Amino acid sequence: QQFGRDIADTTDAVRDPQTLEILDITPCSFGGVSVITPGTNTSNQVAVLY
Amino acid sequence: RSPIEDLLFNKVTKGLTVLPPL
Amino acid sequence: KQLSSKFGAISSVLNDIFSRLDPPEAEVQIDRLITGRLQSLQTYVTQQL
Ligand SMILES: *[C@@H]1O[C@H](CO)[C@@H](O)[C@H](O)[C@H]1NC(C)=O
């Protein structure tokens, strides 16, 4: 078994040469951002959401 | 939570995000 | 299942197509697979709405 497989049929493991390490494929992903602001007639201050 | 509420809670059991309820 | 489907293309991963196929007709294969993924996801969001 050189590489594993997940439900979504994507690569999640690999057999690196000379080390035989696990080396899971793509653990890290993106992150979401949202903006909270009041009406333009009051002010223009904003807040950042995750 | 109520004991009935607790029983009901116990009975109920990659590019995707789930919005938490408000 | 839909994102794992080939949708009639060569491979389900764009990286292999980009690193193997010539720039001609690679965009055709990419467009075909992504529009299969589209029509699947608009159908999906219609059932959820
Ligand atoms: C890669 O080579 C090393 C020795 O150079 C060997 O120990 C290892 O098993 C090899 N990896 C394989 C055959 O997957």
Defining traits:
part of a larger assembly, 3 chains, 50 residues, mainly beta, two-stranded antiparallel ribbon, binds 2-acetamido-2-deoxy-beta-D-glucopyranose, viral protein/immune system, Spike protein, RBD, Antibody, Fab
Give a written overview of the molecule.
This is part of a larger assembly, with three copies of chain A. With about 50 residues, chain A is mainly beta. Chain A has strands spanning about 35, 45-50. The two termini of chain A are about 40 Å apart. The interface of A and B includes residues 6, 8, 10, 29 and 32 of A. The structure holds 2-acetamido-2-deoxy-beta-D-glucopyranose. 2-acetamido-2-deoxy-beta-D-glucopyranose (NAG) binds near residues 15 and 18 of chain A. Chain A: This is Spike protein S1. Chain A: It comes from Severe acute respiratory syndrome coronavirus 2 (2019-nCoV).
